[PDB]
Write a protein that binds this DNA or RNA. Sequence first.
RNA 1: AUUCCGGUUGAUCCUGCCGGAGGCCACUGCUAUGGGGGUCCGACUAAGCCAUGCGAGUCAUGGGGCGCGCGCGCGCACCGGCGGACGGCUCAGUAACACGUCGGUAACCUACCCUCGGGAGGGGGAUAACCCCGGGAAACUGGGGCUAAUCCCCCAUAGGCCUGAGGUACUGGAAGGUCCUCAGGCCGAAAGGGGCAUGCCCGCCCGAGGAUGGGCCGGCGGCCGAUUAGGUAGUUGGUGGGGUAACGGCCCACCAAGCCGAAGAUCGGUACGGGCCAUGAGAGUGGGAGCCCGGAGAUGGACACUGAGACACGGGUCCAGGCCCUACGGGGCGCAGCAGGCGCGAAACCUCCGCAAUGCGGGCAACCGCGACGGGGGGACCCCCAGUGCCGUGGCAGCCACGGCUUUUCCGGAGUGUAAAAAGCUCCGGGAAUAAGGGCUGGGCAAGGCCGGUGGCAGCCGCCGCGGUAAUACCGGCGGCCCGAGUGGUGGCCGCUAUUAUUGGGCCUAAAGCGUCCGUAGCCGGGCCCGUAAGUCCCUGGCGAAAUCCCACGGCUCAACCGUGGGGCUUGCUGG
Lengths: 241, 174, 95
Amino acid sequence: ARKGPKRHLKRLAAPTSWYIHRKAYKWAVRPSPGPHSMKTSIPLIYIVRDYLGYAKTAREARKILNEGKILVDGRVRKDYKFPVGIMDVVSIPETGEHYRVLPNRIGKLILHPISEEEAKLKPFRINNKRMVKGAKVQLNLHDGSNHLVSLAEKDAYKTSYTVIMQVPERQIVKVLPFEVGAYVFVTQGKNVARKGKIVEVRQFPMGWPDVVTIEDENGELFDTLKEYAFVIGKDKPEISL
Amino acid sequence: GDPKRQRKKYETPSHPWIKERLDRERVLKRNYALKNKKELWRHETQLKEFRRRARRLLAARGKQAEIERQQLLQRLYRLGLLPADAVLDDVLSLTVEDVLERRLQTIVYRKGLARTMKQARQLIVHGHIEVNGQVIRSPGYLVLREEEDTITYAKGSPFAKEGHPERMVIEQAK
Amino acid sequence: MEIKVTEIRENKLLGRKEIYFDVLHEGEPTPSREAVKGKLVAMLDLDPNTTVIQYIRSYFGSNVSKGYAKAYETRERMLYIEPEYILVRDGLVQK
RNA sequence: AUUCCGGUUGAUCCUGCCGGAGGCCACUGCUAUGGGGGUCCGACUAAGCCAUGCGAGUCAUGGGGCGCGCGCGCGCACCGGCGGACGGCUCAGUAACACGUCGGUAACCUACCCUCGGGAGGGGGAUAACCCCGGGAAACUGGGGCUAAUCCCCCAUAGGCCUGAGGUACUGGAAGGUCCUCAGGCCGAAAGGGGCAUGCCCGCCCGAGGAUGGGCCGGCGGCCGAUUAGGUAGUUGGUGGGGUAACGGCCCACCAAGCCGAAGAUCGGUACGGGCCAUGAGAGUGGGAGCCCGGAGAUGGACACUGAGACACGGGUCCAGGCCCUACGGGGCGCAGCAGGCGCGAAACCUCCGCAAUGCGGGCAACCGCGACGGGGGGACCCCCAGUGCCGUGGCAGCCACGGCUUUUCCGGAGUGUAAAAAGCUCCGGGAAUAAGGGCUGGGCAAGGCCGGUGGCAGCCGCCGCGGUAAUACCGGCGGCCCGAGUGGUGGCCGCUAUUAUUGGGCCUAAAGCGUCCGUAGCCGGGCCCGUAAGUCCCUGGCGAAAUCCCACGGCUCAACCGUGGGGCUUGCUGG
């Protein structure tokens, strides 16, 4: 019987969001707790080794990681268990390479190459709000991170808006609201990786979440949940998809 | 629960001692130079699988249905059992002799590289026959349509010389 | 025996040149690591040191084998990244 | 292949059962050349007992100190820190919110990890190692002296918790929640340490949140038994409190008389649950050892300490039952971990090599450790591809003589391969030589009306039936047929079986209508009109892990196998 928490993970039990061979071996890297969830993230060693192919074993990957040759959100990361997730940026400055992490229409995560200019911005989705001592407002974002704001400007930040921020120094620019003409990118569900504009919102009673309708530029309509609709622009995108 | 076990790819008859089946299988075994009944039975099973797929797909409505239809027809054209302008009803007229004609032993005989089917089997198994570029040693390989013209003798093989005694004895037939 | 380079690839993080090449030996056996290394260095202007062969592989009937090689900039980075068993297997280190 | 055949009569048609003929699992007789892949091998009886060796460690960049060489460098142990609660084995118990699925916690905890906002002030102490002296058969263990810390303690400040009165800034579907102000009180932090260097690396404490992992609740769903019919007495609820991390008869005090049940309670039997598997044309029947997710247990039973987490397989205490060492005063142990042994049985392997790959813990890192994992050894475990010769002339009816050829396989060797090996792959030399059996031979049912022996004896035989002196049915010889590195015997499941029948059986005479009536639940119910929209139908959102199943493409010679993608499976739940 189990007397405590788990520390291993088998390959047949790994999430579906990964590009991994499940029968080659028995063991997989269990990620460490961190910003994103388990169903929405992949460790760094798999990126270094199986996606880009800069190493064939794990010793080599650990060795490159322990020398600051790879960044995530403008920060150095030496832990091969750190979970990388959606809207995050992987940067190798020794090769001039910058990738943005996004899902497919299938539900798996990939690497979309971008430029050095767009590598310095990261969008965030406001997921909740709190009042903390000193009478200040704390925004709880979608990667599990947090931001502080003054009381005077509380009405400008709500629980589904999007905020663009310089990544390392973490300064805000270009808030984006949730309205009936905003651009959207779906992150989970059956309609993942689709994109379009908002049309209508719908609420329901006693615990059931809110729904939203969207129109793609071919003219077709589709519904999904409101917490799955990432806002990235007003009329056109601000990042590359 | 119970886990997976690998299963046979050939079927046996329901009764072992019926005169008609015995006679037919005897004739086929003799005229195609097979070693056992397993080979005959597994070719027959291939046929039956094709035939069941056709019977299922026929009159099934959707998108995966037509996808699978086209897949089946293209697979058959590639194997060499159907022409291009074919339809799903041309499958049910196929027989086992075609599957038996699509194997290396028979092709090596019909091409003039061997005097007999047994000689062709020996050549294949000893490694004197080449496909497009390769050495294959399995007389039941089910040659494709684009390879039937790339079948020759291997560079390292005595038969690859035009003056070999046995190769001359082989060309003496034609 | 012929040696035909199929692909070269660059690695700035570890500091290496990865090389995929084919070997053609029609009528001969699978060649030796010494010979393959000699030909590689002669043809690509490399150092007989700072170069290792990870594998030479033969297939069922091909008379065409395959190889994988790595060329390092410095013997130090070499001894640091590569393990010792290939170094001994090549002859760049004495156990 | 949506199938039939033999058997009750002097002969016939029926019913109805027995047998044959197909597949999968376990034991087993005779026989056996070679490779590849794979989730195979003390599960069934004894969750019975275990000799030996291994299965969990790491940090010298936390601290003082000893030794060996030139303050520096190497090595050993000690204090201290993290881990040892994962992984690995098994199927006893359990008919249960244990499991599956949908939801919930506004009723809760969380060390390692991420983000943000803030802090590191002032004092004290001991004690291992080290030295002196020891005791005891051992296991274990005493006294004195000296010393350090990221060891221990104390003040302060932050902060944590309770209550009362107000304000209404936040989230949310909804505030016994968060924020602001005041008041009365209990508990009460910290290592600016280490390293490099003339600031950078690794770190300590508080708070708000998340992630990871868990605890608790609910609706639906899935065995047999009436030769088991009434059960329950903290039992069902309420008011007030205690206790828990937290809701709660979880427990306590007081007031009531309720709760379950023939749509089968209670009791008894068997049994880990599912994804899955076998079979069948399908409906359906049957099983659930091996791989994955969940649960439970560590000789039986009960109880506790340390810790974020245990009532803790390789840590503790006791009783019972077993065994071992002893200097007889006393001490120690429980393989359902890898191998190995005894016992039980019809019934299951080497006391091997390695941390190179995949992963875990520790560590700034380099790196160390791991019977997990990987790699070989033995085995008619399952699947895929092959071999035991080919050609031509002649003679017979597949064989023999003759003359040539090839080398899969065999014998020997060089490379590559491999952690090291082995095998496998490429090449070379020799040489048709190095390699077929098991069951059957009266009908069912394919194949002898041939020969010798036995003489109602001996024996055969799934069933029918042979054998009593010319035996096609026993035994053997010679011939022949089925399958073929396999072929036969015993037991179990599905099918055969429309002999359990929703699809889809039958009850005058073959098994089978209650002796006849009246009626409770329940099932079935006349025609038109209006309404609702519960069942039913269509469209769409969120879920039903992966492996397994079907198809196409691509990579190992093709295949088996692996990978990319597209579909189903998940017997269904839920929002519009």
